[PDB]
A paper describes a structure:
VRC01-class bNAbs target the conserved CD4 binding site (CD4bs) epitope on the Env trimer and use the IGHV1-2∗02 gene segment in combination with a light chain (LC) bearing a short five amino acid LC complementarity determining region 3 loop. Most Env proteins do not engage VRC01-class bNAb precursors, unless specifically modified to do so. Therefore, we previously re-engineered the BG505 SOSIP trimer to specifically engage gl-VRC01 as well as V2-apex gl-precursors. To assess the activation of gl-CH31 B cells in vivo and to study the selection of indels typical of VRC01-class bNAbs, we designed a trimer that could engage gl-CH31, as the parental BG505 SOSIP GT1 does not engage gl-CH31.36 Accordingly, we introduced an N279D substitution that establishes an additional contact between GT1 and VRC01-class gl-bNAbs and named the resulting trimer GT1.2.
To confirm that the N279D substitution indeed allowed engagement of the conserved W100b, we determined the structure of GT1.2 in complex with VRC01-class precursor gl-PGV20 and PGT124 at 3.8 Å resolution. (D) Crystal structure of BG505 SOSIP.v4.1-GT1.2 (blue) trimer in complex with gl-PGV20 (orange) and PGT124 (cyan) Fabs at 3.8 Å resolution. The structure revealed an additional potential hydrogen bond between N279DGT1.2 and W100bgl-PGV20 as hypothesized, reinforcing the GT1.2/gl-PGV20 contacts, and, by inference, gl-CH31 contacts. (Right) Close-up view of the W100b hydrogen bond interactions of gl-PGV20 with N279 and N280 on GT1.2. Moreover, the overall structure of GT1.2 is highly similar to BG505 SOSIP.664 and GT1, with Calpha root-mean-square deviation values of 0.6 Å (GT1.2 vs. BG505 SOSIP.664) and 0.4 Å (GT1.2 vs. GT1). The resulting trimer was well formed and remained in a closed, native-like prefusion conformation comparable with GT1 and other native-like HIV-1 trimers, as assessed by negative stain electron microscopy and gel electrophoresis. Moreover, the introduction of N279D preserved binding of GT1.2 to other gl-bNAbs such as gl-VRC01 (KD of 1200 nM) and gl-PGV19 (KD of 94 nM), thus effectively expanding the range of VRC01-class precursors that can be engaged with a single substitution. Thus, with the N279D substitution in GT1.2, the range of VRC01-class bNAb precursors that can engage GT1.2 is expanded through an additional conserved W100b contact. Moreover, its thermal denaturation was also highly comparable with that of GT1 and BG505 SOSIP.664 as evaluated by differential scanning calorimetry, with a melting temperature of 68.0°C.
Numbering used by the authors:
A (entry chain E): 84 to 134
B (entry chain E): 196 to 248
C (entry chain M): 32 to 61, 64 to 140, 152 to 186, 186A, 187 to 309, 312 to 321, 321A, 322 to 397, ...
D (entry chain G): 302 to 309, 312 to 321, 321A, 322 to 354
E (entry chain Z), F (entry chain Y), G (entry chain X): 518 to 546, 565 to 664
H (entry chain N): 1 to 113
The structure:
Amino acid sequence: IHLENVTEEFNMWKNNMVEQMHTDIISLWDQSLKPCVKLTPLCVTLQCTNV
Amino acid sequence: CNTAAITQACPKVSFEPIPIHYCAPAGFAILKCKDKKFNGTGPCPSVSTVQCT
Amino acid sequence: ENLWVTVYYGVPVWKDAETTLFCASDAKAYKKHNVWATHACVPTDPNPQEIHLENVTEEFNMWKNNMVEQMHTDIISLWDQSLKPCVKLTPLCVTLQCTNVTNNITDGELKNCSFNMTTELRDKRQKVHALFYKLDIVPINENQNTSYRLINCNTAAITQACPKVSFEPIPIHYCAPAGFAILKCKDKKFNGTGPCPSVSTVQCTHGIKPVVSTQLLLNGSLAEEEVMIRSEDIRDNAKNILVQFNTPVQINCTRPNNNTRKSIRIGPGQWFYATGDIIGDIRQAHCNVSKATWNETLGKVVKQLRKHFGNNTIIRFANSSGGDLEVTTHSFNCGGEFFYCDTSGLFNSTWISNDSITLPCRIKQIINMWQRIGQAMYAPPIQGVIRCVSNITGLILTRDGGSTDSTTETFRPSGGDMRDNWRSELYKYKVVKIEPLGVAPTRCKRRVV
Amino acid sequence: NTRKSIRIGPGQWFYATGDIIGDIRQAHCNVSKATWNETLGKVVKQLRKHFG
Amino acid sequence: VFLGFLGAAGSTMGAASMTLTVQARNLLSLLKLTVWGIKQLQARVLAVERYLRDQQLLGIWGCSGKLICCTNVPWNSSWSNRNLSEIWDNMTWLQWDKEISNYTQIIYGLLEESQNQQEKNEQDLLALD
Amino acid sequence: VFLGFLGAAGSTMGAASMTLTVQARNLLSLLKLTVWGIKQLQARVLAVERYLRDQQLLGIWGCSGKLICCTNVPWNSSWSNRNLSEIWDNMTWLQWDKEISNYTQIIYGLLEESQNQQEKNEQDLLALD
Amino acid sequence: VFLGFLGAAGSTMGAASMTLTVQARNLLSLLKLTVWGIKQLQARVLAVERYLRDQQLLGIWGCSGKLICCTNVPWNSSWSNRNLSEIWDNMTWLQWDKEISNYTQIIYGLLEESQNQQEKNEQDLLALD
Amino acid sequence: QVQLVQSGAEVKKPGASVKVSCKASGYTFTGYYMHWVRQAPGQGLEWMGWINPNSGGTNYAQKFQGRVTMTRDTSISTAYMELSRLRSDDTAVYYCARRMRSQDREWDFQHWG
Ligand SMILES: *[C@@H]1O[C@H](CO)[C@@H](O[C@@H]2O[C@H](CO)[C@@H](O[C@@H]3O[C@H](CO)[C@@H](O)[C@H](O)[C@@H]3O)[C@H](O)[C@H]2NC(C)=O)[C@H](O)[C@H]1NC(C)=O
Ligand SMILES: *[C@@H]1O[C@H](CO)[C@@H](O[C@@H]2O[C@H](CO)[C@@H](O)[C@H](O)[C@H]2NC(C)=O)[C@H](O)[C@H]1NC(C)=O
Ligand SMILES: *[C@@H]1O[C@H](CO)[C@@H](O[C@@H]2O[C@H](CO)[C@@H](O)[C@H](O)[C@H]2NC(C)=O)[C@H](O)[C@H]1NC(C)=O
Ligand SMILES: *[C@@H]1O[C@H](CO)[C@@H](O[C@@H]2O[C@H](CO)[C@@H](O)[C@H](O)[C@H]2NC(C)=O)[C@H](O)[C@H]1NC(C)=O
Ligand SMILES: *[C@@H]1O[C@H](CO)[C@@H](O[C@@H]2O[C@H](CO)[C@@H](O)[C@H](O)[C@H]2NC(C)=O)[C@H](O)[C@H]1NC(C)=O
Ligand SMILES: *[C@@H]1O[C@H](CO)[C@@H](O)[C@H](O)[C@H]1NC(C)=O
Ligand SMILES: *[C@@H]1O[C@H](CO)[C@@H](O)[C@H](O)[C@H]1NC(C)=O
Ligand SMILES: *[C@@H]1O[C@H](CO)[C@@H](O)[C@H](O)[C@H]1NC(C)=O
Ligand SMILES: *[C@@H]1O[C@H](CO)[C@@H](O)[C@H](O)[C@H]1NC(C)=O
Ligand SMILES: *[C@@H]1O[C@H](CO)[C@@H](O)[C@H](O)[C@H]1NC(C)=O
Ligand SMILES: *[C@@H]1O[C@H](CO)[C@@H](O)[C@H](O)[C@H]1NC(C)=O
Ligand SMILES: *[C@@H]1O[C@H](CO)[C@@H](O)[C@H](O)[C@H]1NC(C)=O
Ligand SMILES: *[C@@H]1O[C@H](CO)[C@@H](O)[C@H](O)[C@H]1NC(C)=O
Ligand SMILES: *[C@@H]1O[C@H](CO)[C@@H](O)[C@H](O)[C@H]1NC(C)=O
Ligand SMILES: *[C@@H]1O[C@H](CO)[C@@H](O)[C@H](O)[C@H]1NC(C)=O
Ligand SMILES: *[C@@H]1O[C@H](CO)[C@@H](O)[C@H](O)[C@H]1NC(C)=O
Ligand SMILES: *[C@@H]1O[C@H](CO)[C@@H](O)[C@H](O)[C@H]1NC(C)=O
Ligand SMILES: *[C@@H]1O[C@H](CO)[C@@H](O)[C@H](O)[C@H]1NC(C)=O
Ligand SMILES: *[C@@H]1O[C@H](CO)[C@@H](O)[C@H](O)[C@H]1NC(C)=O
Ligand SMILES: *[C@@H]1O[C@H](CO)[C@@H](O)[C@H](O)[C@H]1NC(C)=O
Ligand SMILES: *[C@@H]1O[C@H](CO)[C@@H](O)[C@H](O)[C@H]1NC(C)=O
Ligand SMILES: *[C@@H]1O[C@H](CO)[C@@H](O)[C@H](O)[C@H]1NC(C)=O
Ligand SMILES: *[C@@H]1O[C@H](CO)[C@@H](O)[C@H](O)[C@H]1NC(C)=O
Ligand SMILES: *[C@@H]1O[C@H](CO)[C@@H](O)[C@H](O)[C@H]1NC(C)=O
């Protein structure tokens, strides 16, 4: 809905939508990895070579 | 392994970004600035309102 | 003569009710994330409104108070929320081989224990040294050698508390939601239960500092006028006796040992903080209480004890003859370390008709508070020298009973529960719900029209 | 059966099966055949209401 | 002369009824999963539940905007036989609410049915022409 | 004669309208993370939301305090052509709500605009002198 | 003629006050511990609390059910010196709320005290005989 | 089904010590105090003292103050009563009692060994 004769101040740098969204994406990442396989035993000493 | 723990991402979840709309609860509204030449900050002449981004 | 009912909205009527009270704390800005104030609690109002109720007599019962059971379940729930994200010392249950850290001393409360520990890598194992207290370690063979283990590894799990959280109690205002009210008893001479003459109403309680104590009540609220002897049943020996002082007694406790923090990595991101070598002299912790003040205060108590056991009788005080661990010592936290002070020198008097007292204290690091069978906390080493000065304002006594013909009466300190700590700060408060609806007959009728 | 509790960690207690005291007998359920036949018959009378 | 919230709780029913505006004001006014947050959330919902509960009863009784409201229900002598001088100049609302507690459920049922359940239909037919 | 909650569901609309206070009463009234707590808390919030939803419409329709409310909106014949005898003495509110369900949205729009959006401005101009 | 939610934000106060019902409608309407569920539950309670906040103030002003409510408080010239033509036919509700924002708390304090704190006592004494 | 099982008969020398067992079953052992009452042959009951399994705090009677030591073992749910320096009159049947589940207080010994 367009608002005629309305002049509003904006400030993309002091926006609170960015600070909330950044906390939303981070929170979604941890919840999608908690039930997945943790690779803590995969810290064995590796003996490698060149292909 | 020297600094932090490691977790394998499940092979079922996908990392493809899909559109996400941010909406405002009741009693609140989101004002969109439709100015073509709108820089970072400052007053916006053409202002509309939406419920979701 | 013709009477009709009439609706009145806002009548002063309340009824005894138990609801969920929420937190209220002042704007203490700051090193943060203390367990109690936690992330966000409701900011107290700039000006509290204490409203006195004239000619109002309300029944009180501090011993059947529901505010105590809520607060007791809030402290315990706050503890677990602050230990879930911290490091668990489950691999620290390796067979320890200790010796005497006693600096080559002939004829010690702490042992030196070297052990094999896991590293950031799985296949790699390290051997590190760390100082432990004798109270947190038992021998593994009793056959006997010099091999040991942690005290908890046989019964409960252990989790290392995070070094950022502080155990310092800050004031907590328990507040009642809208539609409920708290009735405060402002009677100076109000004993445990019974009718309170002067009753007022408040929205939140006063700043109650949750000081987890034993025997001695530290940093508590003083009683006005004379000292108070509160008990669920004075004629019952199994029921504890809560005593509240009028003049605060001072107690200075220090840990002279200048401990050091030895951080050793036990896994990817897992950092176990152990005790390094103590810099300086080895000195066990102790507390000083003014003998002139304690004897004076103790005398003011026996004057009120004779008001319930005969105007002239024999009253003696002995040390705790029953229990172990934390119920037989004045246990409390101070700067992060948990003290366990022997109060045998405080309760060693007999009553009929500047030279301060020194109390030996022992310190642990694996503690089991609030009957928690299954969860043990490891207090990380507090770096530096510790000194805190407290106000002892209350006691928790216990009779010995027996077949005595009311000739002599002994009193011993105890601390069988932690709910008794909160009752000494909730004895005057009482939660009631507000019922603003009341009907009454008058000579007014609604117009039929 | 008997409960043979064996500790497998700090606070972790695993409860296993001890030796069976007495005879070795497998579990079973009985049910009265006369009552089961009677109830089974009362069902098939209602089943014929949907199958002729 | 104001005493405060519930200030006339020990007063007679006539002196306390003169300050009904006092108790009416103080009757409504990274993770938020803290135990205090849960307590605050459940306390705010608990507060508006008791507030709307009282306004709901005043709505079905036709007394939404007023603090003293007359009705059509005649006072039954079985509820209380006291005289007008013996109630408003001798008893308090506390001991009065304890005396009528066994009949408040019956009164409320008649308080909504005898009048505002009947008045709205009579007012509908009175405004019919 | 009271039957109980939803007692007049099968009765005529005229007989059911005499028991509006019955549905009005029964319409609103270490860790608490239990599945039942989450349900119970979410049920109380969902309950008070639906209650204020209806009271919200009663505010903009000028019918806040009443249970039966006359308006200024004329009934269009396109919504229903039945007479008062066929509606109030032969139909139930259930089968009546089913017959007007296709127009209840349109009626609501005129119900807030035709009167209380116009009456309050006229009340301002009539009380202007 | 309806424009939508906040449609008359840039119009004059006289043209915007004729659409009070528009903003009034859109003002209220295994584990559920997801980040979206906790936020949703806390938002619904936040919504109904803001709504009851305004309704509470309209209750102490005697304007609970009305959309345009006249009072007994005289308008002080210190608040604004403009004329009715310079306010209702030159200013919008946005820039008008900015000019009186320094006095809205004083007006609200007098709005509850000048009338409904005084009228209810006089309403009781006038209907006393 | 509260079950209280004590140890077997003991025979000791005067001045020696004796420890009496009392294993509980059928309830939460760490929620109720444990009392000890003895009775000389042909005499009446005599309360000795109660012990709180929670913290271990006891309450010996003034008659046995300095002779009896009451301990408990939470892992096996067994309270112990040890009497040092036995005299000639200590010959008695030693019972361990427990309060009632109801009434929220002690001094109503419903269950006995
Ligand atoms: C009882 O109340 C007293 C007084 O409120 C508590 O004493 C407090 O002790 C802490 C811990 O030492 C003090 O914090 C210290 O601040 C200094 C900075 O000056 C810093 O160098 C120390 O490392 C420490 O962080 C605190 O200042 C002190 N209180 C006051 C008002 O100064 C005591 O801990 C309370 N509890 C008990 C059980 O006694
Ligand atoms: C505790 O044991 C450790 C060994 O695990 C000791 O550490 C070394 O002790 C020797 C003397 O015995 C010193 O020369 C070394 O400098 C110490 N450090 C290291 C890294 O080897 C430690 O001194 C012992 N502490 C006590 C009080 O006996
Ligand atoms: C406890 O020991 C620490 C460690 O030595 C002391 O801190 C040292 O103080 C001296 C003062 O001359 C400094 O030169 C050192 O740099 C400090 N140590 C470090 C690691 O920086 C501390 O002073 C001791 N405690 C007290 C109360 O003096
Ligand atoms: C309470 O005080 C008594 C006082 O006797 C302590 O008992 C003494 O403990 C020492 C230390 O081994 C012994 O040498 C004495 O023989 C004991 N005396 C008696 C009469 O038993 C007792 O230890 C104190 N309480 C605590 C918990 O230590
Ligand atoms: C299952 O057990 C029940 C136990 O009650 C059996 O029922 C009993 O059968 C005996 C047979 O002599 C009767 O004397 C009792 O009166 C019965 N009691 C009840 C409560 O019914 C039952 O028969 C058993 N099941 C089968 C299939 O036999
Ligand atoms: C954006 O436009 C506004 C218009 O008033 C101006 O004040 C501001 O300086 C501009 N910013 C930039 C970065 O050009
Ligand atoms: C080492 O410590 C033990 C612990 O009490 C002590 O008994 C022993 O005497 C100490 N060693 C020497 C040589 O004294
Ligand atoms: C560490 O491992 C080595 C090699 O097995 C062993 O000799 C030593 O005794 C171990 N130390 C401890 C404290 O277990
Ligand atoms: C307080 O004193 C009264 C007066 O005798 C008594 O009835 C009541 O039991 C006492 N309460 C307590 C807890 O001592
Ligand atoms: C001790 O008591 C004094 C006097 O009541 C008080 O000023 C001081 O703040 C108290 N300190 C503590 C730590 O309670
Ligand atoms: C405790 O320390 C303070 C420091 O100001 C001192 O005034 C007080 O006398 C001390 N009290 C004792 C018992 O050591
Ligand atoms: C306590 O004070 C009394 C009264 O003056 C005195 O007789 C007694 O010796 C004092 N006791 C101690 C331990 O100071
Ligand atoms: C208890 O007090 C007496 C009398 O002053 C004293 O001789 C005794 O040593 C005290 N007890 C201890 C353990 O010091
Ligand atoms: C199982 O076999 C072992 C073999 O030594 C024997 O000792 C044991 O008694 C058997 N039974 C059980 C219950 O373990
Ligand atoms: C079931 O019972 C009925 C009546 O007792 C009998 O006629 C029928 O033969 C029975 N059927 C079987 C399979 O036993
Ligand atoms: C209390 O009693 C006095 C004396 O009768 C009276 O003047 C006053 O109004 C009363 N107040 C209340 C709140 O009961
Ligand atoms: C009077 O009260 C009785 C008992 O409460 C009730 O049954 C009766 O209907 C009432 N009568 C009137 C006329 O209100
Ligand atoms: C009302 O007052 C009179 C005295 O004037 C008294 O006789 C009568 O019993 C009272 N009515 C009651 C108590 O119901
Ligand atoms: C239901 O139908 C019967 C038909 O005789 C009628 O008498 C009654 O009023 C109706 N409503 C009821 C029973 O609620
Ligand atoms: C009823 O609605 C129809 C369809 O919009 C319209 O044509 C007709 O004029 C309306 N009549 C009345 C009386 O409102
Ligand atoms: C009312 O409507 C019904 C059904 O459409 C019809 O039978 C009847 O004639 C109409 N008029 C009256 C007066 O009932
Ligand atoms: C409402 O619309 C549906 C969809 O066309 C139709 O089936 C139904 O009959 C309509 N009902 C009325 C009362 O107009
Ligand atoms: C406006 O406020 C001032 C300051 O309080 C006062 O002196 C004046 O009388 C007021 N005027 C009106 C018209 O209210
Ligand atoms: C009114 O409030 C605004 C807020 O920005 C301020 O700038 C202005 O100076 C205030 N005016 C007066 C007269 O206080």
